[PDB]
Structure formats: structure tokens, C-alpha cells
Amino acid sequence: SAHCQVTGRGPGFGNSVSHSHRRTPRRWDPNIQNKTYYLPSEGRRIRLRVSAKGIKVIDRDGIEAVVARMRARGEKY
Amino acid sequence: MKLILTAEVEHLGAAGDTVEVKDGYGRNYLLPRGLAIVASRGAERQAEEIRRARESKVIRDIEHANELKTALEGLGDVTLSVNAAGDTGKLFGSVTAADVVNAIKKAGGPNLDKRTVQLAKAHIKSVGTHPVTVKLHTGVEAKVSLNVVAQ
RNA sequence: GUCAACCGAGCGUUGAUCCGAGGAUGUCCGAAUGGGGAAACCCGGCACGAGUGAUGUCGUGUCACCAGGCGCUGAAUAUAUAGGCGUCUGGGGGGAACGCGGGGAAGUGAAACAUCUCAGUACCCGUAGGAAGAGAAAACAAAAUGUGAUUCCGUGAGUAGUGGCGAGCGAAAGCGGAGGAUGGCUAAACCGUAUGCAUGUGAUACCGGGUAGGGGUUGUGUGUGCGGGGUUGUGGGACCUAUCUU
RNA sequence: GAGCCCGGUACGUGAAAACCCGACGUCUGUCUUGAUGGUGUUCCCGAGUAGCAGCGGGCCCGUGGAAUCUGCUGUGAAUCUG
RNA sequence: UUUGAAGAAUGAGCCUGCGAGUCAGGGACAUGUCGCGAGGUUAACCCGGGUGGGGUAGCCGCAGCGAAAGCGAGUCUGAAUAGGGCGUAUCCACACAAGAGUGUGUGGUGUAGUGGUGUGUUCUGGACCCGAAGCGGAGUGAUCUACCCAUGGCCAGGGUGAAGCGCGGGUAAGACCGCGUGGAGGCCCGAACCCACUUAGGUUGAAGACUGAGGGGAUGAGCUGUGGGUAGGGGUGAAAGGCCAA
RNA sequence: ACAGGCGUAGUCGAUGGACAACGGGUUGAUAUUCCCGUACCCGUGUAUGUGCGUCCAUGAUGAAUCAGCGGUACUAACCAUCCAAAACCACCGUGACCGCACCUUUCGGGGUGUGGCGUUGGUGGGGCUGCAUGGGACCUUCGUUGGUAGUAGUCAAGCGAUGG
RNA sequence: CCGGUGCUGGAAGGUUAAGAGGACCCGUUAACUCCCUUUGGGGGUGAAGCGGAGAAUUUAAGCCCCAGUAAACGGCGGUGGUA
RNA sequence: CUACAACUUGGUAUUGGUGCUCGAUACGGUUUGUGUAGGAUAGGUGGGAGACUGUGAAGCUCACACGCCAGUGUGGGUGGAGUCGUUGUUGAAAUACCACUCUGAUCGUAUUGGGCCUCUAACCUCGGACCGUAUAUCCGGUUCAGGGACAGUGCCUGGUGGGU
RNA sequence: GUGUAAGUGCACAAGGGAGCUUGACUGCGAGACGGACAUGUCGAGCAGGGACGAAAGUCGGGACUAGUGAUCCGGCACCUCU
């Protein structure tokens, strides 16, 4: 995928099941979405690819904080 | 989402109240309008609620209030406080819109919005005296006469 | 130089041929990078210089892409932004193995076979380094008054065990050793700070008491960036508060 | 078929320049305005995390009574009688 | 190799050279030999120009029975010394009991394992050698052939005579009829060209799929050229399980 | 997931489009290529002259007003319409309701037509206040013209698109 | 020809996952009441809490079921006797 | 036979507001305790010597209704001092006041839920217009219009499934 | 005739009948058969505690041979094992 942006919750690769096994993965994706937000600092609307988890992070942490944390990682937002 | 209301709303209460509501309501409707505030801290939330309430009450305007502010925008010279280097004639840091509007607060009276201030047309960071204009109305806009504190 | 002779013409005691380290030159293709291209071949721009009666021509340089920093502008549109223009530094690809993270089979064995095994091997990817990774206890142990970062080797052990309890897989603790740095640096409470979004007790508060001018070291908030203080386990630390006070 | 012919060995010599080791003096900081201990209570000790549930990986361990380590979702706590 | 091959069962043209039970590992079992002997021996490692010295962590023996606790020359089961199972190197000498097959208590004789090495078999590894069809991963290939796209070119020559149009008859007006023009057609005969039906030959060929004489289509669902695209469980296919570099 | 898949600007790509040469001779070997002759298409200089317009200014336009005639027309307010605010009179099966004679187990409960305020209710017309409408103008004023102000400015050698 | 299989439609029912629930019990034990020799060992009740497997109940599609559909796959019979 | 893709169902995060309707949970006054002695459905139960009335009560017709239809409590209104005190019968006493409150049916209040009618602010728009842009059926951004807590995506789950 | 196929046996009855009744037990087992191996078959005799019988003595299923299925993995009751 375009890859998460605030955390880095990438995929994973499972395998087997019950009822006798069979070996066979099925990526365990993450739940990213395309929520947008508003930066009152620079007067702008930003769209991101963020999981619901990361939305939780935002609403109990801020957006400025998050973009600074992403600036660190230098994601091409 | 534990948040402190700023205005009155259906089935919540009135301004100043404290409510535990649904997360998305508070996420999408209230909080990104400056109509509420998170409840994280006692005095922090209290001060933010008080100040936001005063500012929301004081920010209003109508078309005729714009027609009157179009006349009252020719105020006296509203000066601006500065820390910079007068060595070469360049300013250390760009000066806010809050500073200009609080100068108007303590000189002329109107406590306007930082948003509509055409500070770009001011071109701060050249030491001198910058003119200014503001989106008061759709069509009507009036001008202010300004000066700077020499550094 | 040579396979590799032949011929011709020469140099060398004024130190040749030869050997070593550094420099210079370094056509064209190639990450290839001015644009283009069937790889090594076609066309140009800009500044300067050479050249013709002028054009053509020639020479020296430089012009790609992105990431970041700085600088100018801030389109719809108001704030202002994406973007645009200039400059500065990086990266770009190759490599024989060795490494770490991720993906990831099958023939085979099971006298068939799917679970299992072959193997997390081959191979593929992304990035490295001269080595890598791990690494300072939210660990082991068993009432012994014990050990004291990690890694790699020997043993424990083909054992305890696991397993269509079938084929087969398979430790660790502990013990002896190599090497020793039983290593260091931070965040938070708390202050001093620049600030930045807010407001206005507009005052008995900003500080060492007190003698006090002010009348706000903004009055009180709140995160930000800087500086101190603080780095622990038998708990420590910041407030507090006595004592000697190198 | 060579100890005494030749090349060379045992052995001792040798570097204007460049490169690598330390060695130094520069240069750079850094503690110095300090410490040892006392004493009774408030505050802090790394949060979308640890934990629990659902699918999965790998650990001697094939879901089994199955800890510890972990990946994705969902939910989601306290600071030392922790 | 076969019950049985001189065998009309296979293999070998001839010579010369090359070509198949191997190695690892303190692995396992059995057995020779050597050192030690109720003891035996070291591993990693350290020091050693060398093959040598050290290194006690470990392993094998020295007591077993029992699922286990646990007990101990006895122990387990069991209510039981009441029989049995396993064990107490073995033999030797005296006793008591029975001859249901011998046992039980004494005394002495006193227990032999381990580490190197050689041989044989054996376990894990390609495991005496050669031999598949075929499974999987990553890539190369549409210059042949299948289809499509873009753009050009080629189809001698001779016949038939549709629609329409005109004139005339006919009409009340038409429909209808004749003469002419026009010159359509997945039309006709036939070369180039594209195919390939029969037949003869060729069949260690002229040819790794052809030739001779005849044959089908031959203005169209055409043939062909230049450039290009689709790629492997996938393509493409006027579909035969055909074609995708003999 | 990463590798990489698509793809706009753009850039490459003829098998096509546009673009200027024909004949003869020559060597042992080349030839619309060299030679002979006659032609053509790009650009480039020097000079010759016919007309040239910038400067002179030669002609030829508009701005746009102070404003006058009549007329969109916040409009002070006027020509015609209904309905119902409170609502006017006439009457009609009335929630409680005041209430003639009687059905009715012999009676505490099941009713009827005329009768009365109320008119939870129903029909008809007239003084009626709110209403907006089309018509003509006044303020604003937009349409028609005298001075003016084609005066100061403006178009006029050319080349002229990377656009239509 | 609508029985069998399939397609479309419609849910009165029966079976029906996950999830939400968490009755009742079983582990552990703060605290008591007896047993005994004595240097507290062995028995019972055993609060809340933390845990274990957990029911009752509410649960959709589907399936069973009700009709239609064959230019939809498909299927189309015998003995006897009488002129 | 086992399994996977793809499709599909539901729960859940994204993902919310108001209204109505249908459930049970708890704070709350409430309907309601037929054993004979007998006014006799005797609410069991702990203080217990008057009993609430008059901040307007018997018997009462009627608004009401259950119904174990003998009977039950309730209210417009007269009534204006009435039943009653262990009334005595008893395991048990009033159904006197006060009350821990259970086998009950009703109903306010926090809820916990679902379904339905809707708003928009998340979200979607290969719908439009403008800009970056000179060129761009791309892409992004603003805005208009619309849809709309549905759909899409993630995680768990059931089903069909020779398509593999 | 012998519960059920056939054979070997049964009159000395193992056939027929009547009374008590649970040995259709527990802990073992000398020596033997048969034997690829695992399986399979009988077994006198000892001990507790019983039945029947007056006692001797017989009874560890049925006149005998068929009537059933290894191992692994789970389930129930009891144990003074962990």
C-alpha cells in the first residue's frame, strides 16, 4: 500500500488455519483510511493515510505534534 | 470525548458546560470549529474555555458592522512592538497578526480576526512602515495608516 | 613490450632501457546526467575566446533528475498555501563471498499421501560494514546467603521432551573457556529562559525575608525550542530543611 | 646429480616523497559557585503503550492445561502499599 | 539375466587411454592389537617455527528395583515371608530341606572396564556408478507460425449484364411490358499470385516435408510488404487439442 | 508490502506527408556524386538604383461631460380584485347542559320530535381591516442630442505568432 | 412432463456461525468452629477480588420448505383380452 | 477428499444528530397476599395505645375498570364527624400510624439496544466551473450541486465455489 | 437330545428334572503346548473372603472348539504417585 504515515503499521504475513492445515498466508493489512484534517497554523486542509489507531493518536495528541513527528521521518506528505 | 462546550447546542446544554459525548461528534463537528475543547487539565481547560468563550462572543460582525468598520478602519497610527537588529536594517523575526490586532485593541478598540489581515501586502521583514488592508466586506475594504518602533 | 623474425633509422656514462610513490593529459559509450539514441553515434543552447569581407565552422567551459537547507513570489482566495525562479550540499551505479530485517517454493523422505519433512534451504527484495547484528538486565536461579552486559566455541544432549507419539525434529539452565568496558548518554517532576495560540484582578501581585519608587521581571494561563538539575533498585530523584561547609 | 660457477639464501643494510600506527606540543572543551551526610510529607520515574479478547508467526512445544517473545485489527491502566 | 541360452534373447566393429563400495564423525554394534588398570580419557583453549607440555568442564564404569514417591543387595506388586518378576560376575567347599524338576543360609576365589588404532556391517550426507518422464523459482523468446493495429502496394485478359435513368406501348393515373443506357456482383472461364485435391517419383533424398504433369480461389470474409503489440497454466485460435523459432 | 503496474505534459518513432537536376561523356574498377552544358531552391555580404515612413506632421476616427426633450421607476402615494381580524342578520342532527308524554325485568342503568342560553359544531350575503397585482409619472433616472472634448491621445514602412 | 438437478422469486415456519451477554459452578483465600499429640498438623463453612472453562437469551445469509421456469441440463412405459 | 481465489452474509473500527416505535435492566409512588372462627382475599412482617380527617372524610348515584364476575380500589360532586382498638376468634392482626420491602400487573427516570422517517459535518462523486497550465478527457487544490453514516477499505465470521 | 454349523464326545451321562444360590470372584502361579514375531490355550497348587453339601470335595462361566479388532489419542470412578 502507499504505507501508513504516522506510526508505520505495515502489513504482516499469516499462514495456516484450522480443520487440518494447508499452509497459506493472507497478509494481515492494517486499516488505513483517507481521513482529512485542517491545519489552523498554516491555513490548510491535509489528507493523510492513517489508521483508526492513528486517528486515536491524533485526537488525544494533536495534529501539529504529528506532522512534526512525521517531518522527522521525512515522509513526503 | 470529554470536552468543555463553548456555545449552546441541542440536548447537550449551554456554554461552559462539561459533557462526555460520542467521539466522532466531537471529532468532526464541534472541535474543528472552535466550538469546544478537550478536557485534559483542570486549569488549562478552564483558561482555554474562558478565553475562547470571550473571543467567540467578541468575534461577531454583520454586513452593516462591516459598513461601519469600513469607516472606523482609518484609525490612529497603531504602533507595533519589535525586537530586531537595527545594525543593517533587517528584522530578526516576522511579527504576528495577533500583535497587530492587540495593538488595535490597546490603541483603537476593535479586536479583529487575524485571518483576514492582509499581512502579505504588508511585506514585513523590511524595516520601515508597511501599509495594510483587510477583507471587511465582500466589496468594501478600507485601509489603516501604520508605523513601526525603531530598533 | 611480445607471439616474432626481417629490414630501416637511432639513442645512451651528460647515467639510457628498467622499478617504485605522486601529478598532468585523459577521444566516444556506460549510473550517463544538455536533448535524443538501434551502446560506443546524431542534433543543439548559453558565456568567453580563436577565425571569414558576413554567414557557416572551431576551441574552453557549463545546462538532467530527485531529497534537504537558504533566498524571491503566494495562483484560484481572504489568511496563506501547493507550485514557480536562483543558489549550496548530498544521493543515483558496480562488486567474489561474509551480515542483518522481510518475502519464500518444489522435486525428495514418510516405501502412497494432504498435516509434517526436505528448508525458513535455493531464490527475490531493501540496505550495510570492514566486519556486521545483539548488548547493559522489567535476566537466570532456588531458598544455596548464589551468579552478575552481550556474542562466538566445548559439554550438557541426540538427553528432558515434541511428534498423523509415524518419518523424524530437538533445546535451555548449568559447567569449563577466549575477551573484558561489572560502559556511557537522555526524557519527566522542578527552575531560568526566548517565545507562540489566549486573555486582561487590568492589581496586592511578579522576588530572599525587611526598609521600597514604580504599577506589572505581563497578571494569571498553555504547548513549543534553549539552558540547568536529574539517571537509580537495598529504590532513586525534584520539592522541603539543619550541619561541616577543601 | 654443483655447499665453493651463476642467481640467491643465513645475516645486516636502505627511503627524497606518499600512506598507516602512536607520540607529542597546538586546538578543542570540561569540572571548577563545592561536597558529604541528615529529617517529615506532596510531586516524577519514558502511553494509544503494557494488559485482556479474535485470527497468526516462532520459540523442544503441530492448539494443547500452554507461560515468556511477538505481527494486524478492536478495546484500553496506573507511578513505588506501583 | 534366466527353472533352462551354442543359442534365431540383450550387449560389444578393432586398438589405445579414461570410467563404479569412497570420506567425514571422541557417531553405533561386533571383533583383533597396544597403553593403563578400579579405574580410563580429555574437549574447546593456552603455550609451542613441528608432530610436544598443560587444561577436570565433561563422558564411560564402579548397585539396582519401581510408573513415581521412594527404598537399597535387596526392591515392586499384595492384606501376606506367598508365590512370582528383575537384580545380587561365575565358580568352589560344608551344611539343612526336599528329589515338583533343586533351593536356602555360611565360608572363602574374588569381579573389568576404558582410551587410541586396524577390519566388517551400519546412521546422517549426492553415499558403489550411469540413466528418465516429469515438479518448482527467476528470466529469454511473436524475425517462423495464430490474431489485431498503423501505413502503402498488387490482382493480365475476356464474358454475363443488377439497381437506377431515358424513350415507347399500357394506364384515367398506375402496376405492368419492350427497346436502350448504366456496368453491381463474398458472379463466371483463365495467367500472375495464395494454396496443396488426386497421382507418379523421391524416401542413407536435389530437399530435416520437394519436384513433374494435372487441380481449387483468382474485386475479396483477399494475398502481401515495412514498422509494431499480446507470452507460459499464460497467449492466440472461422476451434484440429492446432500454433507460440525444425 | 518492496520489486514494480499504468499514465498526462512532452519526446521518439515511416511503411506515409511537404521539400531544389536533366541529358551526354570518362577509368582497369565510381557516378543524377567528378567533367562538359544548361537549370533550380536556401541563406549571406558589397554596391547600384525605384518607390519609404518614422522625426515634420498629411488625412481619419472615439473618450466624455455641465447637461437640456421624455421615462426602469426605495418611491409620497393613486385607477380595479377578492377571501377572513373582531366580525353583521337569518336560520339547523347540539360534549356537560336546563329537560313535554311514553316504550321499558315491577324500579338504581338503554332513548325519542317539537322546547332554551351555549352556539366543541353547519349554510347564505354586506359597512369590512392585511393583502399584491397590471397602468402614468415624481426622487434616484435611463433612453434621444447643441456647445463640445476625432483638443491633449489614437490607425496608417514593416517583420508579424510557439496563438485563431 | 416442474418430480430429480440448476436459475429467478417469496419468507409463515424448523436447523442455523461470529459478536453482545455471563445465570450456575469449579480453583485460590481474608475469617471462623470441631480433632488431637503438642513445639500447630489436618478437616469444614469459606466475603469481595483475580482466574478457568460458561449456559439462558437475542442472533443474518444459507439449507429444509411454497409456487414459476424446458428454443434451461434433462425424461417419454408394460402385461392381458376381445371382431 | 482437504483447501484457495473470486462473489456473498453478518458483527466491528472509519461513523455521527434530532424524532418515532418495540425490549429487559436499575431510583421511584404503584396493582396485589381468597386457611376455617367470620364485617372476612386475615399483605405476611419489626416499634405498637388512637386514625389518617379538616393544606376540606362516611353511605353515595355515576367517569372508570378488573373479574378468582360472591368481590375488588379508584375519582366531578353532596356528605361536614365514619368506619373502628387486640376489632373475638388466632401458628398470625388489622386492612391503625411507621416500615427493612419479597411471589406481582402497571407506570415516571439514567440507561442498554434495535428498526423505521429524516439533517449534514465525516466519506464518495468518470458531475460541473476556476486555478497550477501556454499547452494537459491525467493529477492535485478551492467552490457549486448531489448522494450519505449507506457504500468503499481493514480485522473476525457462516455459505456456494472443479474457476484453480 | 445336546441353545446356534460340523466334527470329537456324552447312557459312568456333559441329556431331563427339582432346592439353595452368584466362583459370570480378588492376589498369584510351578511346569507345559503351540510356536517367525505380536497374538493364543490349558494349568495343579497357596492366601483372604464366600456358595453348596452331613462331609469328602467341586466352583477363577457356559460339553469343547467360533461369536470379534492390535497401537496411538481422548473419556468415567478410585488411589497415601508427582
Side-chain angles (χ1 to χ4, degrees), chain B residues 44 47 51 54-55 96 98 105 114-115 117 119-120 135:
Chain B
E44 182 180 359
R51 70 181 177 87
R54 292 286 292 109
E55 184 64 19
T96 68
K105 179 179 180 183
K114 294 165 68 169
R115 300 297 193 191
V117 175
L119 186 63
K135 183 181 256 73

Side-chain angles (χ1 to χ4, degrees), chain B residues 90-110:
Chain B
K90 284 191 172 187
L91 299 171
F92 287 162
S94 60
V95 185
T96 68
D99 287 331
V100 179
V101 162
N102 190 349
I104 300 164
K105 179 179 180 183
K106 67 193 181 190

Side-chain angles (χ1 to χ4, degrees), chain A residues 15-70:
Chain A
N15 259 358
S16 277
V17 310
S18 65
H19 204 78
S20 36
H21 320 183
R22 188 40 63 110
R23 292 173 296 180
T24 319
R26 31 76 88 289
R27 292 191 200 218
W28 267 263
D29 279 340
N31 192 31
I32 63 100
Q33 315 241 95
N34 279 255
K35 183 72 172 63
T36 191
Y37 289 103
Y38 183 70
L39 289 170
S41 63
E42 64 185 5
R44 184 169 184 260
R45 239 201 257 101
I46 291 266
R47 53 160 308 194
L48 296 176
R49 292 167 195 87
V50 303
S51 56
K53 237 176 43 183
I55 296 164
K56 252 159 114 77
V57 175
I58 281 171
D59 72 5
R60 194 215 31 86
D61 197 74
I63 69 182
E64 332 274 357
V66 171
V67 292
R69 286 176 174 274
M70 285 201 299

Side-chain angles (χ1 to χ4, degrees), chain B:
Chain B
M1 190 186 291
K2 292 166 280 184
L3 59 87
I4 317 309
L5 305 185
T6 297
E8 190 184 3
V9 186
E10 290 177 353
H11 298 280
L12 289 175
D17 295 334
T18 297
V19 305
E20 178 179 359
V21 79
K22 277 173 178 286
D23 194 357
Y25 184 77
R27 195 195 309 286
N28 295 320
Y29 190 78
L30 299 171
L31 190 67
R33 293 176 187 270
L35 301 173
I37 46 167
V38 186
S40 65
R41 184 73 174 178
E44 182 180 359
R45 186 265 294 169
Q46 184 68 74
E48 291 177 351
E49 183 66 47
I50 293 168
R51 70 181 177 87
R52 181 65 178 176
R54 292 286 292 109
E55 184 64 19
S56 65
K57 183 78 270 278
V58 304
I59 70 171
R60 295 178 293 173
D61 59 27
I62 61 171
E63 184 177 359
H64 187 335
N66 287 280
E67 292 178 352
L68 296 175
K69 293 180 180 179
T70 301
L72 299 175
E73 187 65 354
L75 294 173
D77 302 338
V78 181
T79 192
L80 300 174
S81 64
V82 174
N83 187 8
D87 296 335
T88 303
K90 284 191 172 187
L91 299 171
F92 287 162
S94 60
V95 185
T96 68
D99 287 331
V100 179
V101 162
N102 190 349
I104 300 164
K105 179 179 180 183
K106 67 193 181 190
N111 195 2
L112 292 174
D113 289 330
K114 294 165 68 169
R115 300 297 193 191
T116 62
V117 175
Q118 299 180 1
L119 186 63
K121 309 301 182 182
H123 302 274
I124 286 174
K125 307 301 293 298
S126 70
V127 179
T129 59
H130 303 290
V132 166
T133 305
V134 178
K135 183 181 256 73
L136 301 162
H137 193 268
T138 298
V140 174
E141 294 178 355
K143 298 187 182 179
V144 180
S145 60
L146 288 90
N147 289 307
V148 183
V149 170
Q151 188 65 31

